[PDB]
Write a protein that binds this ligand. Structure first.
Ligand code: 45N
Ligand code: CL
Ligand code: CL
Ligand code: CL
Ligand code: MG
Lengths: 142, 137
């Protein structure tokens, strides 16, 4: 998966495609919009390939990581999604949506204590009042 | 092994080396590190991360090696993976902040140390993070 690629790239420490600016920003933006065109039409497998492609080229990009994590969550690959949401959070820091979705994933993974901590984190630190209501609704059920 | 290469799995997933032997190799990697045998520690931590990319302590060991060698971006990259995988541990975020300072990105560094202080339950780590924050202009 995308995380394995990132680690192998770091181990080998050779030149990557991004290191040589092999795909310009404007082309990456286009491929990202094509990925969502597929996603929005229900073509989830093609969207997944396009987001994997984006994450091979530029893994440490919140928008690419969040798109892929969403696909994994829909596909009920909850651990893979949670792992990617955590990468997105560590890169973004100020957006608590990846924490909220991780909490959803942890519930499905039968880890309610982890899920509770995720949702409490949202309520304490997010300034998105609507996200906080959603998180509280999950807390009410645990 | 070839199947794991062709199917993306880890060597750990197929129990290619016994558990206690891997423990020994990790200990030897750490011995090299503590003795300043950085070239050998790097080989050993790379070996460990090839064996199990998903092991947070293996990743952290290689990231520390890269940080010592002043490959600050490469260290920061691994620290982001180490965070995402690990068990509510903000230590990789703290070291990312150090890396960002060395990369002349003090606002990114500040956000790292602030994240540690807002969400870590490691009091000693938060003390260190605050000392860096106190110093950031
Ligand atoms: C912190 C960061 C995250 C996250 C979830 C968390 C919070 N976990 C709980 C807090 C105490 C331990 C369990 O999902 C994305 O990134
Ligand atoms: Cl938020
Ligand atoms: Cl580097
Ligand atoms: Cl900066
Ligand atoms: Mg508030």
């Amino acid at each position: 998966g995308s995380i394995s690629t990132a680690v192998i790239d770091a181990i080998n420490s050779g030149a990557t495609l991004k290191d040589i600016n092999a795909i310009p920003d404007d082309m990456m933006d286009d491929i990202y919009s094509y990925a969502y065109d597929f996603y929005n039409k229900g073509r989830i497998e093609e969207a997944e390939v396009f987001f994997r492609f984006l994450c091979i080229y530029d893994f440490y990009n919140v928008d690419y990581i969040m798109g892929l994590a969403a696909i994994y969550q829909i596909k009920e690959q909850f651990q893979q999604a949670a792992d990617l949401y955590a990468v997105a959070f560590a890169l973004g820091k100020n957006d608590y949506t990846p924490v909220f979705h991780t909490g959803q994933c942890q519930l499905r993974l039968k880890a309610p204590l982890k899920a509770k901590e995720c949702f409490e984190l949202v309520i304490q630190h997010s300034n998105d009042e609507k996200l906080k209501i959603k998180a509280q609704s999950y807390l009410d059920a645990i």
